[PDB]
Amino acid sequence: KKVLTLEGDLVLGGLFPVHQKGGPAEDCGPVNEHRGIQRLEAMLFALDRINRDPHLLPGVRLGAHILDSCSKDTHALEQALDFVRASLPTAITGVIGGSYSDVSIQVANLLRLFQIPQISYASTSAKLSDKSRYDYFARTVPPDFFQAKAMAEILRFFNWTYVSTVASEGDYGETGIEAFELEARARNICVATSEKVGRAMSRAAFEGVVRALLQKPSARVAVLFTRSEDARELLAASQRLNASFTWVASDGWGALESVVAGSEGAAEGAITIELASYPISDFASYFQSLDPWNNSRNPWFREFWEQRFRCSFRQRDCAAHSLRAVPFEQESKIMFVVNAVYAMAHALHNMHRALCPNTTRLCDAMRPVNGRRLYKDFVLNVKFDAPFRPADTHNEVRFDRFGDGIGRYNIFTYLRAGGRYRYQKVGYWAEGLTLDTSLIPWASPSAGPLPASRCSEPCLQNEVKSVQPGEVCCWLCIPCQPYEYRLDEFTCADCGLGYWPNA
Ligand SMILES: *[C@@H]1O[C@H](CO)[C@@H](O)[C@H](O)[C@H]1NC(C)=O
Ligand SMILES: *[C@@H]1O[C@H](CO)[C@@H](O)[C@H](O)[C@H]1NC(C)=O
Ligand SMILES: [Mg+2]
């Protein structure tokens, strides 16, 4: 029903789950205070900032046409038609949106048809990377399977070249482990066994996965690209069978305490990753100073207020509440919302430099904006330092050829405490791997050798390597004859007579 509108020379569409799914008779349920209101307000914060920037779009004002998805894909489609009739009211240049992947999938299916570029800030489905279906979709949040590069890198650091994999049934597990296979292959890493897990699976069947993993004793590292329920039930089975693996797990496990519910011994030693975001102070100040009377531009703020504070404007018990009151907790995806808007603004600024080099004002070269040129030539080719990034960081906003966002993950380790059991940040994956070994108990005291996960033990000084043409993880050690010298790692060479090597 309601729509948030802002006038500008160029207008950006927006799609947010301001309300939860309706359910029965109603189309829209209660307000999403964090995933809805706070994300919505991070786009308005961003638009405000760009419009005050003397360098980015100096003479072009950005407006907005923001709609509520109601968390339902069908509802988001009916609303999204406002963007397509506008591109032929007021033309929509791009759409910043799609929270849920179901709503971005359906919206990307409509927008491609009318060539409207779209950048999502929270839609992580791997399905959205299929450019034969969603060819106008790009995103600031990385696809769930991008962490496979950070995972394959963690292995390479510890020289774990022979590992086992466990992946959840579904798009998350399947595409993630497919991405891991490829990244591993590239880093000269082999997969001993590949097992599958499902929620439908019994307590008896999770033990079958542990027994499968135990069939490959040399592969002590188990790489998980599994959902929380799967990772939890796997550790429970590993626990029951006294099976000790060196876990390297995706954000499905991440730093969650619930995944390690009564399976602390099995989990001890794990390496897990989570998607990282930094906070933005300027946003905290902006949001916390919002009130129903001063924030009239957001049509959903009165309903948000009455809900959050349990007040009523009729009962006049609303004006007594504040957002400064409680300490501000910034939602996970805020940074990506701010980046999605800025990516659209940089793409447009770069296009205006190309098609409009005589002014700062908008020309007929951009009246209207060519969607195809905007997406392929400018949106895809953006590289800018992230807005509001911390002082010591070198964070950068860019996309791959499929419009997939380049991400940053934190690396954690599960350890035995004072007794108790906790997660400790051990490193990170920026555009490369960096972690402090001194923070992992199974490396930190020098005590004990590194956990092994090789297919073959190293050859002695007197032996050459024997590999199958192509295959390189597994080898045979072939001892050079007493009279033989080693030319290289794979070749021996006779010295006839009157010649011998430095033994
Ligand atoms: C494997 O890892 C160790 C550090 O854990 C490193 O010093 C060594 O050079 C690596 N081996 C190879 C073959 O590069
Ligand atoms: C667990 O397995 C180890 C060998 O890896 C064995 O020495 C020990 O007795 C077992 N512990 C329990 C609690 O069953
Ligand atoms: Mg400006």
UniProtKB/Swiss-Prot annotation:
<feature type="glycosylation site" description="N-linked (GlcNAc...) asparagine">
    <location>
        <position position="294"/>
    </location>
</feature>
<dbReference type="GO" id="GO:0035095">
    <property type="term" value="P:behavioral response to nicotine"/>
</dbReference>
<keyword id="KW-0812">Transmembrane</keyword>
<feature type="disulfide bond">
    <location>
        <begin position="459"/>
        <end position="477"/>
    </location>
</feature>
<dbReference type="GO" id="GO:0098978">
    <property type="term" value="C:glutamatergic synapse"/>
</dbReference>
<feature type="glycosylation site" description="N-linked (GlcNAc...) asparagine">
    <location>
        <position position="502"/>
    </location>
</feature>
<feature type="disulfide bond">
    <location>
        <begin position="356"/>
        <end position="363"/>
    </location>
</feature>
<keyword id="KW-1003">Cell membrane</keyword>
<keyword id="KW-0770">Synapse</keyword>
<feature type="disulfide bond">
    <location>
        <begin position="455"/>
        <end position="474"/>
    </location>
</feature>
<feature type="binding site">
    <location>
        <position position="101"/>
    </location>
    <ligand>
        <name>L-glutamate</name>
    </ligand>
</feature>
<dbReference type="GO" id="GO:0007216">
    <property type="term" value="P:G protein-coupled glutamate receptor signaling pathway"/>
</dbReference>
<dbReference type="GO" id="GO:0010467">
    <property type="term" value="P:gene expression"/>
</dbReference>
<comment type="subunit">
    <text>(Microbial infection) Interacts with H5N6 virus protein HA.</text>
</comment>
<keyword id="KW-1133">Transmembrane helix</keyword>
<dbReference type="GO" id="GO:0060292">
    <property type="term" value="P:long-term synaptic depression"/>
</dbReference>
<keyword id="KW-0807">Transducer</keyword>
<dbReference type="GO" id="GO:0014048">
    <property type="term" value="P:regulation of glutamate secretion"/>
</dbReference>
<comment type="function">
    <text>(Microbial infection) Plays an important role in influenza virus internalization.</text>
</comment>
<feature type="disulfide bond">
    <location>
        <begin position="190"/>
        <end position="473"/>
    </location>
</feature>
<dbReference type="GO" id="GO:0099171">
    <property type="term" value="P:presynaptic modulation of chemical synaptic transmission"/>
</dbReference>
<dbReference type="GO" id="GO:0014059">
    <property type="term" value="P:regulation of dopamine secretion"/>
</dbReference>
<dbReference type="GO" id="GO:0007194">
    <property type="term" value="P:negative regulation of adenylate cyclase activity"/>
</dbReference>
<feature type="binding site">
    <location>
        <position position="39"/>
    </location>
    <ligand>
        <name>L-glutamate</name>
    </ligand>
</feature>
<feature type="glycosylation site" description="N-linked (GlcNAc...) asparagine">
    <location>
        <position position="242"/>
    </location>
</feature>
<feature type="binding site">
    <location>
        <position position="124"/>
    </location>
    <ligand>
        <name>L-glutamate</name>
    </ligand>
</feature>
<dbReference type="GO" id="GO:0001641">
    <property type="term" value="F:group II metabotropic glutamate receptor activity"/>
</dbReference>
<keyword id="KW-0325">Glycoprotein</keyword>
<dbReference type="GO" id="GO:0030424">
    <property type="term" value="C:axon"/>
</dbReference>
<dbReference type="GO" id="GO:0004930">
    <property type="term" value="F:G protein-coupled receptor activity"/>
</dbReference>
<feature type="topological domain" description="Extracellular">
    <location>
        <begin position="1"/>
        <end position="503"/>
    </location>
</feature>
<dbReference type="GO" id="GO:0051897">
    <property type="term" value="P:positive regulation of phosphatidylinositol 3-kinase/protein kinase B signal transduction"/>
</dbReference>
<keyword id="KW-0966">Cell projection</keyword>
<feature type="binding site">
    <location>
        <position position="35"/>
    </location>
    <ligand>
        <name>L-glutamate</name>
    </ligand>
</feature>
<feature type="disulfide bond">
    <location>
        <begin position="311"/>
        <end position="318"/>
    </location>
</feature>
<feature type="disulfide bond">
    <location>
        <begin position="28"/>
        <end position="70"/>
    </location>
</feature>
<keyword id="KW-0732">Signal</keyword>
<dbReference type="GO" id="GO:0097110">
    <property type="term" value="F:scaffold protein binding"/>
</dbReference>
<dbReference type="GO" id="GO:0030425">
    <property type="term" value="C:dendrite"/>
</dbReference>
<dbReference type="GO" id="GO:0045211">
    <property type="term" value="C:postsynaptic membrane"/>
</dbReference>
<dbReference type="GO" id="GO:2001023">
    <property type="term" value="P:regulation of response to drug"/>
</dbReference>
<dbReference type="GO" id="GO:0042734">
    <property type="term" value="C:presynaptic membrane"/>
</dbReference>
